[PDB]
Design an enzyme around this catalytic site. Structure first.
Site, mmCIF file in Angstrom:
data_model
loop_
_atom_site.group_PDB
_atom_site.id
_atom_site.type_symbol
_atom_site.label_atom_id
_atom_site.label_comp_id
_atom_site.label_asym_id
_atom_site.label_seq_id
_atom_site.Cartn_x
_atom_site.Cartn_y
_atom_site.Cartn_z
ATOM 1 N N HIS A 1 28.124 -7.683 45.194
ATOM 2 C CA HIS A 1 27.855 -7.926 43.774
ATOM 3 C C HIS A 1 26.384 -8.219 43.476
ATOM 4 O O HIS A 1 26.025 -8.494 42.330
ATOM 5 C CB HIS A 1 28.750 -9.042 43.192
ATOM 6 C CG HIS A 1 28.514 -10.408 43.769
ATOM 7 N ND1 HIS A 1 29.344 -10.966 44.714
ATOM 8 C CD2 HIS A 1 27.586 -11.352 43.474
ATOM 9 C CE1 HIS A 1 28.945 -12.203 44.976
ATOM 10 N NE2 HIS A 1 27.884 -12.459 44.238
ATOM 11 N N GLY B 1 24.043 -19.187 42.591
ATOM 12 C CA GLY B 1 23.007 -18.787 43.524
ATOM 13 C C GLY B 1 23.429 -19.023 44.961
ATOM 14 O O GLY B 1 22.691 -18.709 45.896
ATOM 15 N N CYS C 1 26.219 -17.646 46.430
ATOM 16 C CA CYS C 1 26.875 -16.562 47.151
ATOM 17 C C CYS C 1 26.034 -15.965 48.260
ATOM 18 O O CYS C 1 24.807 -15.864 48.148
ATOM 19 C CB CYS C 1 27.377 -15.491 46.197
ATOM 20 S SG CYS C 1 28.743 -16.168 45.182
HETATM 21 C C1 LIG Z 1 27.938 -16.499 43.583
HETATM 22 C C2 LIG Z 1 26.944 -15.754 42.728
HETATM 23 C C3 LIG Z 1 25.471 -15.727 43.078
HETATM 24 O O1 LIG Z 1 24.970 -16.308 44.084
HETATM 25 O O2 LIG Z 1 24.751 -14.995 42.119
HETATM 26 C C4 LIG Z 1 23.345 -14.888 42.284
HETATM 27 C C5 LIG Z 1 22.882 -14.074 41.078
HETATM 28 C C6 LIG Z 1 29.038 -16.953 42.633
HETATM 29 C C7 LIG Z 1 29.487 -18.273 43.107
HETATM 30 C C8 LIG Z 1 30.141 -19.222 42.189
HETATM 31 C C9 LIG Z 1 29.274 -19.859 41.098
HETATM 32 C C10 LIG Z 1 29.983 -21.164 40.808
HETATM 33 N N1 LIG Z 1 30.642 -21.447 42.072
HETATM 34 C C11 LIG Z 1 30.757 -20.407 42.876
HETATM 35 O O3 LIG Z 1 31.276 -20.461 43.960
HETATM 36 N N2 LIG Z 1 30.051 -16.110 42.510
HETATM 37 C C12 LIG Z 1 30.256 -15.523 41.284
HETATM 38 O O4 LIG Z 1 29.484 -15.786 40.275
HETATM 39 C C13 LIG Z 1 31.422 -14.549 41.081
HETATM 40 C C14 LIG Z 1 30.933 -13.103 40.935
HETATM 41 C C15 LIG Z 1 32.082 -12.063 40.741
HETATM 42 C C16 LIG Z 1 33.088 -12.062 41.936
HETATM 43 C C17 LIG Z 1 31.509 -10.654 40.613
HETATM 44 N N3 LIG Z 1 32.139 -15.064 39.833
HETATM 45 C C18 LIG Z 1 32.708 -16.361 39.779
HETATM 46 O O5 LIG Z 1 32.700 -17.185 40.697
HETATM 47 C C19 LIG Z 1 33.378 -16.709 38.422
HETATM 48 N N4 LIG Z 1 34.778 -16.728 38.688
HETATM 49 C C20 LIG Z 1 35.441 -16.103 37.932
HETATM 50 O O6 LIG Z 1 35.079 -15.432 36.939
HETATM 51 C C21 LIG Z 1 36.881 -16.197 38.312
HETATM 52 N N5 LIG Z 1 37.754 -16.183 37.218
HETATM 53 C C22 LIG Z 1 38.078 -17.399 36.644
HETATM 54 O O7 LIG Z 1 37.309 -18.363 36.374
HETATM 55 C C23 LIG Z 1 38.994 -16.598 35.651
HETATM 56 C C24 LIG Z 1 40.370 -16.086 35.533
HETATM 57 C C25 LIG Z 1 40.377 -15.444 34.315
HETATM 58 O O8 LIG Z 1 39.168 -15.518 33.698
HETATM 59 C C26 LIG Z 1 38.331 -16.286 34.631
HETATM 60 C C27 LIG Z 1 37.283 -14.999 39.176
HETATM 61 C C28 LIG Z 1 38.764 -15.112 39.564
HETATM 62 C C29 LIG Z 1 36.618 -14.553 40.491
HETATM 63 C C30 LIG Z 1 32.935 -18.166 38.443
HETATM 64 C C31 LIG Z 1 33.527 -18.732 37.129
HETATM 65 C C32 LIG Z 1 31.441 -17.933 38.188
#
Ligand SMILES: */C(=C\C(=O)OCC)[C@H](C[C@@H]1CCNC1=O)NC(=O)[C@H](CC(C)C)NC(=O)[C@@H](NC(=O)[C@@H](NC(=O)c1ccoc1)C(C)C)C(C)C
Ligand SMILES: */C(=C\C(=O)OCC)[C@H](C[C@@H]1CCNC1=O)NC(=O)[C@H](CC(C)C)NC(=O)[C@@H](NC(=O)[C@@H](NC(=O)c1ccoc1)C(C)C)C(C)C
Lengths: 304, 309
Positions: free
Chosen positions: B45, B147, B149
């Site tokens: 991603h 940040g 991931c």
């Molecule tokens: C790592 C991203 C990073 O380092 O980006 C640099 C630009 C993050 C890590 C998280 C941030 C907060 N805590 C973490 O562990 N990962 C993400 O941002 C992912 C990216 C996706 C897989 C492309 N997104 C998320 O973690 C979001 N989660 C969701 O959107 C989850 N859904 C629920 O909250 C949901 C169910 C229905 O609507 C929402 C989803 C199941 C994966 C979190 C909220 C940012």
């Protein structure tokens, strides 16, 4: 969303690169190699018969640079000098440790937290985070051979060494010194009956922890009451909690502003928790009031 | 022996992994990467932008990227990417320099209940280390901020670093999900921001038993009794307390600890049985008022014997 909450330690790499083994006579323990100096507990020069009432001045004068064997892995570092600073020995070696990180020696205050890199025979075993107890002892996990292991904090790229392990008390807790060799607590490095003062729970930390739970989305323990600093202490002290001061509430300022919860209102919440218990509920996964997280630790883990 | 007062959740020394962390940027998206020999591993991603995370078409997004689209930095130096490909949910960037700090390592897929150390990282810089357990529901209860991931989970098996986790996301219940180092997710999760829920979790019975053995090893044995139980009878009781069913394989995994203490696994189950039905009565075990379940039989031997790396 929630950041989650773990008792995390600082990455130990910068410290691992400074660990060595130090032997004198038949006793081998850990040493810290920074630049061209190796630091270790002075009791490394004791023989079984000297541990009850040792005179380190007299034991050390009988030693020479070659009485000390220091090893970095399988390579011997030749000692070209030595001196005693309080309860530590400072051994000069003929080569500098290129892995020496930027660092400083700091003497921490009771209630503050740090990371411990437990080592044996100069090799790292594991790392864990803990807090120096109000009574200066550490509720650590150390086995024989662990002396010389150090406690530290890392700010950016700078390592602040604050502890070196020396012994275990009859009660099972541990004691040691800062990197200047001065003991934390009313202890001496000899095998005599010694006791620590009465300990208490670190009130500032429990409150910082309650704020961590809130920023993480949990508010079940809050209430509509408030309290004066004095009234809070009259209750908290009944439960062996450290008296809270105005400086401590000021330290909670940032966390208070981030959550919108007044410090005294959070004290009222703690007051209720102590008087009624948690009724089978948990806070940040815990069934007890956690006190090993400082306000700083909370702001760094929950908000960078 | 350990200081008769609390089993610390000790993490493996993290130095060998810190030397493999780098920063990976694609456009305006920056996260962490794992640099081993001449390959840098990171979550796919990283090629996604703000709004392209609901259901991104990774294969097509990657097509629009060239080696120059990726900026990798080790400390303050740029690492030239000379190749790139996708492997499941990860990207494998080939670079023109082999990591001088590459340690002996291997990729392993962890099993439910097993633990590992997590090195939380941001902008390619390590921030903290803590112990985690892969929950039965395939999630982990970690601590991560934006940040984060790309940060990884691992175990040190003697002289070899065994990488088992790379962080990708957080679930609505506040827990976390990720992949192994082949890019395969643990659990049924997918790397897109859609409705996803973790199943109900259970207490790791194997680990609780391991912890009780650690208690005995440390001299805390008040809870032991002169009785035993059948596997079936234990499970009937434990499952009432939302404990994971104990299997014969689990009994065998506890073999070394049972031998060290001379206490048969079913005899320990009998003790656990009583602890669950009668509670601790204000007493503590290893300084704890609850039954810890994030210490494996291996973690116990590691801390009690003082294994080094
Ligand atoms: C790592 C991203 C990073 O380092 O980006 C640099 C630009 C993050 C890590 C998280 C941030 C907060 N805590 C973490 O562990 N990962 C993400 O941002 C992912 C990216 C996706 C897989 C492309 N997104 C998320 O973690 C979001 N989660 C969701 O959107 C989850 N859904 C629920 O909250 C949901 C169910 C229905 O609507 C929402 C989803 C199941 C994966 C979190 C909220 C940012
Ligand atoms: C580090 C030694 C090492 O690495 O040696 C390599 C050869 C050890 C670490 C402890 C072992 C158990 N847990 C530890 O943290 N340090 C010591 O062995 C010191 C050495 C002295 C300071 C010279 N000794 C102790 O820890 C001994 N403690 C005591 O003797 C204490 N006294 C009580 O237990 C007692 C009973 C009657 O009077 C006192 C003393 C207050 C410091 C323990 C028993 C080994």
């Amino acid at each position: 969303g929630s950041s989650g909450f773990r008792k995390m330690a600082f990455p130990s790499g910068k410290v691992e690169g400074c660990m060595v083994q130090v032997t004198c006579g038949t006793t081998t323990l850990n040493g810290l190699w920074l630049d061209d100096t190796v630091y270790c507990p002075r009791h490394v020069i004791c023989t079984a018969e000297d541990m009850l009432n040792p005179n380190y001045e007299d034991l050390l004068i009988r030693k020479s640079n070659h009485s000390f064997l220091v090893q970095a892995g399988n390579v011997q570092l030749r000692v070209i000098g030595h001196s005693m600073q309080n309860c530590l020995l400072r051994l000069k070696v003929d080569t500098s440790n290129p892995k020496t990180p930027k660092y400083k020696f700091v003497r921490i205050q009771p209630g503050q937290t740090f990371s411990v890199l437990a080592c044996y025979n100069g090799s790292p075993s594991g790392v864990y985070q803990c807090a120096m107890r109000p009574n200066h002892t550490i509720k650590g996990s150390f086995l024989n051979g662990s002396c010389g292991s150090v406690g530290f904090n890392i700010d950016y790229d700078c390592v602040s060494f604050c502890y070196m392990h020396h012994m275990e008390l009859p009660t099972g807790v541990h004691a040691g010194t800062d990197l200047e060799g001065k003991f934390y607590g009313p202890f001496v490095d000899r095998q005599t009956a010694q006791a620590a003062g009465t300990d208490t729970t670190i009130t500032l930390n429990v409150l910082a922890w309650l704020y961590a739970a809130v920023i993480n989305g949990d508010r079940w323990f809050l209430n509509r009451f408030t309290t004066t600093l004095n009234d809070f202490n009259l209750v908290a002290m009944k439960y062996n909690y450290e008296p809270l001061t105005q400086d401590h509430v000021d330290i909670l300022g940032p966390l208070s502003a981030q959550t919108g919860i007044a410090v005294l209102d959070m004290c009222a919440a703690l007051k209720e928790l102590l008087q009624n218990g948690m009724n089978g509920r948990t806070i940040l996964g815990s069934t007890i009031l956690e006190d090993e997280f400082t306000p700083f630790d909370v702001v760094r883990q929950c908000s960078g």
